[PDB]
């Protein structure tokens, strides 16, 4: 509540030796201070004798400490190279980039008229700023709000005025309205035009929408699947007048995409998400209700669509369970694989009418999921050599409806070609030692014998597989192949050398390097990725890593930095589950596999992130299949796995009391009929019934 | 809540008593055993409970220890459990020499 | 009022002007009152409707915010009195 | 003073560094002493180690007198029984 220091933004000189002391900063440095409990916008260039003891002293001192040494490592030393000057400055540059975006406001939450100390009352708006979550939204008065972001305020009024809440939706519960085949693209697609395989998809979802049945979207990995739902959401809203708060659950990795995908393909319905913690938890509820608390279920209704991470489902299962929902969206719904899932019966409690999964999950790996999917969409509904025809007579005829199978043979005609090459790498020197000795406890127990015990099975069928191509995944390996006792050339050479795969990768990489292709590395193991992190920097190739350990904000920054027109790094390394998590790469052509991902198809999506509709540079894929190892066999089982892949009466006096006041306020009100009804002023009656009453009422008047 | 001097001291104690959850985590402990158990024999396996059970034993074993330790500690004009306070306790029980 | 501003000031409402025509001076009202303030007052109803005045007073665009007091004048009726008089006046209603 | 393809992997589940110190104090207060010495709590784990071995010693023995790979929880019980710390609740 007090005026105290919150953070550091910017640092500059105040006044016209070897190391600046703190005094120098006090008598020769001015620092931009952001104040506590107050938006970014009011930042002051202040010193220490200027403010004196103010609550909060800690961050400036250290930051100055960081500053003092920083000064000794840019201008005040001759061990500094060319490149460190680039980073030490660079930080100044990026530290401000993450500070600039807070000044631009992004949404106005509410508007309160609060009194001042001069006896005046001024309007204030709860303002939300860019790429930040709902917390630290402070009140700012309206004087300059439109004076910097007119567009936000224009839109701020529009939603409040656009009476289209879940308050007027048509009763089609009992039975439906006959629905129509669309030819044309709906006058609700501002994002552009779609094609001849995105409007029909939509016409099936909406086509079994009117049946009372739910369906499975099973298309290829990225055939404008997201556009088909958003448009599916859009046409179920201005078609059958459904204001029904639609619930959508998507991955924490793939939502930011969705939002923009939702706010650019369909302006007029607003999209408020759920991605906070403790504080947010409250702000969601601020706008999730009207008029504070509410008897019964009499919430006036201020949203329709939401996006939920999978976490958050389970953390607050209860509140959603109570509120009614009749339409469901989920992203990459191969989650419901087993029928013992926690989200598997978590979803069943949410009073629901129609569902909508949309993933390319292959449905022959196990028959469990094939059944689980069928049991989940439709609770209740469900081999022999010569009965197989009898069997698919039952399975083909029944499964199809709630299924979609459609090949690329679309939009791929423009997109440059797809390709994948295997790699037979035979074993090395130090390699056999630990391919041979490890399958016993001979020299595996002499060196690291205490650990031998726990990894002994790990190493057999879930390591040898993983530690067959590369033995560098334990401790007593690094110096084993390096034959000497600081060297820089040798370490680089010693590490490239041990593996069949490291050399093969180093040369191909070089081979395309001079030709110009952007290369991708998908590794199964977290560490491999540091391993390379250590080597590629050394040999000077600009890169960034994509692990399982990164904040949403940080994940998002680089993904974009990469697909921008003029980005230097053609090397990008990714995960199997963390890599194929979600996202798309449109600049990339080449993708290389170190080891198969203990399974058929984790790779098939793994290449899906790079091989998408956009890519204009064909495609290239390399699989490093190890020889005379254990990699070979799974590769064969993997094959075994993927072998199959298949009127309201009349107007009463009180309304007549309602209509009369509205005329004194708005004059002729025949034009404004729906806006008033959406909000309190009018009951739902047909447009004419009011209009005639409006006219006779003056006719009586004259 | 009165002032602040020795205010929590007795507070946490009470809340901990009403509860009945494991004092020590159930993840570090799990390996600690696996790791020594190897030194006395090879190729080991573990029942889910077996550890659960050890945790129970051990935790309970220590508390008990501390419980005396406390007394000893009191005897001494002190409210501080000490490195030895531990020893006497054990010595007189007899595992400690 | 909806008709005249629509056919001369369409693209931008606020430029709306009185010119010569003279509507009464309001000397003793608590705050600065001058023809420009009336100019906005009318646009304000043109935008929000008669009788909602907090709407009008708060608007960032109008700039009327600390000249309204809904002992301090003019309050809600004072404006109510203000518009009926101006609207009739410029069409020639008081004939 | 080099990146040198550096990879860092160190061990903190099982090993005593890894385990949590509050996990102990959590334990200390149930007894309800006011103060914890730094020296002391280190010793305490020390003893835990001493108690823990002997049991497993026996455990291991009963697992092995029967030629079994899976260690039974009963196996632990008898162990405790031998030192006179038998546990009700388990494995009648
Ligand atoms: N049917 C479509 N019509 C027009 N543009 C599309 C269509 N589908 C996708 N796009 C464009 O391609 C990009 C990614 O879409 P898509 O490939 O479906 O997402 P994902 O990476 O989930 O597959 C988007 O940025 C979008 O502009
Ligand atoms: F169809 Be996607 F990978 F969001």
Curated annotation (Swiss-Prot), chain C:
Disruption phenotype: Decreased sensitivity to the cytotoxic effects of 6-azauracil. It is found in: Nucleus. There is a cross-link at residue 2 (Glycyl lysine isopeptide (Lys-Gly) (interchain with G-Cter in ubiquitin)). Present with 1620 molecules/cell in log phase SD medium. The 2 chromodomains are involved in the binding to the histone H3 methyllysine at position 4 (H3K4me3). The CHD1 helical C-terminal domain (CHCT) binds DNA and nucleosomes. Component of the 1.8 MDa SAGA complex, which consists of at least of TRA1, CHD1, SPT7, TAF5, ADA3, SGF73, SPT20/ADA5, SPT8, TAF12, TAF6, HFI1/ADA1, UBP8, GCN5, ADA2, SPT3, SGF29, TAF10, TAF9, SGF11 and SUS1. TAF5, TAF6, TAF9, TAF19, TAF12 and ADA1 seem to be present in 2 copies. SAGA is built of 5 distinct domains with specialized functions. Domain I (containing TRA1) probably represents the activator interaction surface. Belongs to the SNF2/RAD54 helicase family. ATP-dependent chromatin-remodeling factor which functions as substrate recognition component of the transcription regulatory histone acetylation (HAT) complexes SAGA and SLIK. It recognizes H3K4me. SAGA is involved in RNA polymerase II-dependent transcriptional regulation of approximately 10% of yeast genes. At the promoters, SAGA is required for recruitment of the basal transcription machinery. This is Chromo domain-containing protein 1. The gene is CHD1. The chain holds residues 1143 to 1269 of 1468 of the full protein.
Swiss-Prot record, chain D:
SUPFAM superfamilies: Histone-fold. The modification N6-glutaryllysine is found at residues 2, 21, 49, 67, 69, 81. The modification N6-succinyllysine is found at residues 21, 67, 81. It is found in: Nucleus; Chromosome. There is a cross-link at residue 21 (Glycyl lysine isopeptide (Lys-Gly) (interchain with G-Cter in UFM1)). GO terms for cellular component: nucleosome; nucleus. The modification N6-acetyl-N6-methyllysine is found at residue 2. There is a cross-link at residue 81 (Glycyl lysine isopeptide (Lys-Gly) (interchain with G-Cter in ubiquitin)). Its main location: nucleus. The modification N6-acetyllysine is found at residues 2, 6, 21, 49, 69, 81. The modification N6-butyryllysine is found at residues 2, 6, 21, 34, 67, 69, 81. The modification N6-methylated lysine is found at residue 10. Demethylation is performed by JMJD6. PROSITE patterns: HISTONE_H4. GO terms for biological process: nucleosome assembly. The modification N6-propionyllysine is found at residues 6, 21, 34, 67, 69, 81. GO terms for molecular function: DNA binding; protein heterodimerization activity; structural constituent of chromatin. The modification N6,N6-dimethyllysine is found at residue 10. The modification Phosphoserine is found at residue 37. It comes from the Eukaryota. Belongs to the histone H4 family. The nucleosome is a histone octamer containing two molecules each of H2A, H2B, H3 and H4 assembled in one H3-H4 heterotetramer and two H2A-H2B heterodimers. The octamer wraps approximately 147 bp of DNA. Core component of nucleosome. Nucleosomes wrap and compact DNA into chromatin, limiting DNA accessibility to the cellular machineries which require DNA as a template. Histones thereby play a central role in transcription regulation, DNA repair, DNA replication and chromosomal stability. DNA accessibility is regulated via a complex set of post-translational modifications of histones, also called histone code, and nucleosome remodeling. PANTHER family: HISTONE H4. This is Histone H4. The lineage of its organism: Eukaryota, Metazoa, Chordata, Craniata, Vertebrata.
